Design a protein around this ligand. Sequence first.
Ligand SMILES: *Cc1c(COP(=O)(O)O)cnc(C)c1O
Ligand SMILES: *Cc1c(COP(=O)(O)O)cnc(C)c1O
Lengths: 386, 386
Amino acid sequence: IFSVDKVRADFPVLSREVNGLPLAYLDSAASAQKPSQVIDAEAEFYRHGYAAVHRGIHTLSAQATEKMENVRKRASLFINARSAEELVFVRGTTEGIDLVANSWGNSNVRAGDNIIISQMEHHANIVPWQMLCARVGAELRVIPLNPDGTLQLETLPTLFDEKTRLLAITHVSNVLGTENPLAEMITLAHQHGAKVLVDGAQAVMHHPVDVQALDCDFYVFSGHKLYGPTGIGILYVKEALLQEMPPTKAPWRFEAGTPNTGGIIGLGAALEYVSALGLNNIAEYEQNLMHYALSQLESVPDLTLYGPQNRLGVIAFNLGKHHAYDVGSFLDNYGIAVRTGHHCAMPLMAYYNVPAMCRASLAMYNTHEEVDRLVTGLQRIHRLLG
Amino acid sequence: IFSVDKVRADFPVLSREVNGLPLAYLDSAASAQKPSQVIDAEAEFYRHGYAAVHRGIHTLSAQATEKMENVRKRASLFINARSAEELVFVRGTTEGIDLVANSWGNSNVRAGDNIIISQMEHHANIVPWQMLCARVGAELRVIPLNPDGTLQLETLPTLFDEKTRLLAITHVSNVLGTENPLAEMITLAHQHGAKVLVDGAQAVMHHPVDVQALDCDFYVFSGHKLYGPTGIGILYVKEALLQEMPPTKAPWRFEAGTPNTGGIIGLGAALEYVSALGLNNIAEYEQNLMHYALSQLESVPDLTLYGPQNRLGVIAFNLGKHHAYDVGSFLDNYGIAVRTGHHCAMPLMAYYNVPAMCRASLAMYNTHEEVDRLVTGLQRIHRLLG
Ligand SMILES: *Cc1c(COP(=O)(O)O)cnc(C)c1O
Ligand SMILES: *Cc1c(COP(=O)(O)O)cnc(C)c1O
């Protein structure tokens, strides 16, 4: 069983004070805090094993290359890829998606074709497809939202046709916490010969992810949101699709310039740390924390929530008519870190006819007590400003 | 005055053993070792100040944004840029050059134009221009080498004309250690309205670099070669050239996706560390170490050296008719790390009619004693295999 107090003890930032008050870090969806096992694994590599990694002759370089390829293998097991060679080290989810849009998109999407995204996508899964469509004269189509923050699945027959080359879809919305029915959507897409890229940046820390079971063609996620270092992400490419991506041999073709070995070592340690805790244990604790928060938040007057009741990870909200920026500033003044703004999801904001929302993340190291501070803080803000 | 023993004490890898023997790390040009001030600055950020950085409302996010912008300012002072906003955080020199080739190259190089590179360039300063030239139907022209590893400057009048849009040139050759006459070459290039991109990845650790005095239009270098973390480099863009680079406002337009704040913090600490030592002190010590090495190497039979006598940082060599790979393996078997292969400079190898060379780097933490081990090792290898 999960013990949040033991987990929290691994994270040295969580003891920090902010504005003289104990930090309540509810912004893990923007970036997660890192355990000392991750911090120290990277530091130890720099301290005792550092070298360049291009199968250099000498010992440190050869040992560092092997360390990096062992992390690649561990990442492929983490997402149940068939082969370690299907995994590409990228700088982040943003770059991984862009890499696919140029390497695969440029030679597989032609004039008169269409690409399907959704109205809940992060900008990182919108802009590369907008650019590709303008480059080649294709059409970008958008699955719309329901008020509850789920996709209007009934619109799929009007969007998928013989010229649909790609579906690019978020696994979990970074704003609403909606989890999309990927397996079923992928079956549909493949019936038309379309490939599927999954943006999984908000999925891989909340429960197991199996790309063989999903049968997705591309899958991308971010190291820094998986309790890992910045500057490193993972792009999964189904080995079959390398024949559609013209250029040495794969993974390494897509890793030009010096690898971020520091970040790779830390990412490996983060996968180990998460696996040692167990993703199903994490899921169970976070789901219970989420249910406690949504129940307590019922007692906040004039609170508006956006998204489905079964959200993962994040709670998007606005308080009365107060601007999200001001709600966020008051919460920060209490030592509570939430995120405000458009969350790199302006089409989603436009759908709800707001310019901005507040967002609280509830991660595996957050507590019922921190939820209580958020609830109390929102009540205080409402009294003081209403 | 420089004390190499005090410097070496800051670098924990240098006490490492390899093949049971004390490491002699002569491969800093591939990647440099890092002092604990750099390692710990990054670790400390992760331990006590970590957050996302998009001017997020809350305190940690705001303080982290300010940390990253202070590193940007420190980097601009380090290279004497006019304004911190002229500096772009990139993933590395490879990506920084590619960024210029697409952002500036695509909208300033047209059919029938030409771009000038040199025969000593790293592939990172060749491939983006080859690609751009094929995209737009321009011509790629190459300044050839002299046997001594210097540029054939007399060929410039046949290469520069009214259609020359860009000169892309290495500050210091990663193989030969040749330092090119940038200031003069930049005057010539600007007389034809051509811009100049300088690849400075092997320059910025050896002596001061002043982009205002050079008047270069772009300048790029790598964090991991400047005693800093991996996954981070610097691209300098003369502010005037942002009008020629169409798209928010600059530096930040060219930094999509999450910044590598871990790497940025470590890069700042590396600049501080290098500045505290003093680049002129470093230059003086490395020049004396180099002169000692070239003098001692005279006593190695059948040694071939490539490059000018006034090289910086690296000594490229081959031993008799033995393959560089085998020379490198014997040296590694003695605990001495050199690099072998084509060094990402195949046109340079082809000019010298060899497939590969050995390369020893002599950095600020290397010693006369390590030079003696290299000399002894080469004599031993020659006896044993001749
Ligand atoms: C954060 C995020 C991204 C961007 O990921 P980076 O690694 O920062 O580039 C893309 N998509 C989603 C859903 C995200 O939450
Ligand atoms: C190492 C090097 C590069 C590549 O730099 P990265 O930061 O590894 O991408 C480019 N040019 C020269 C001269 C180099 O030495």
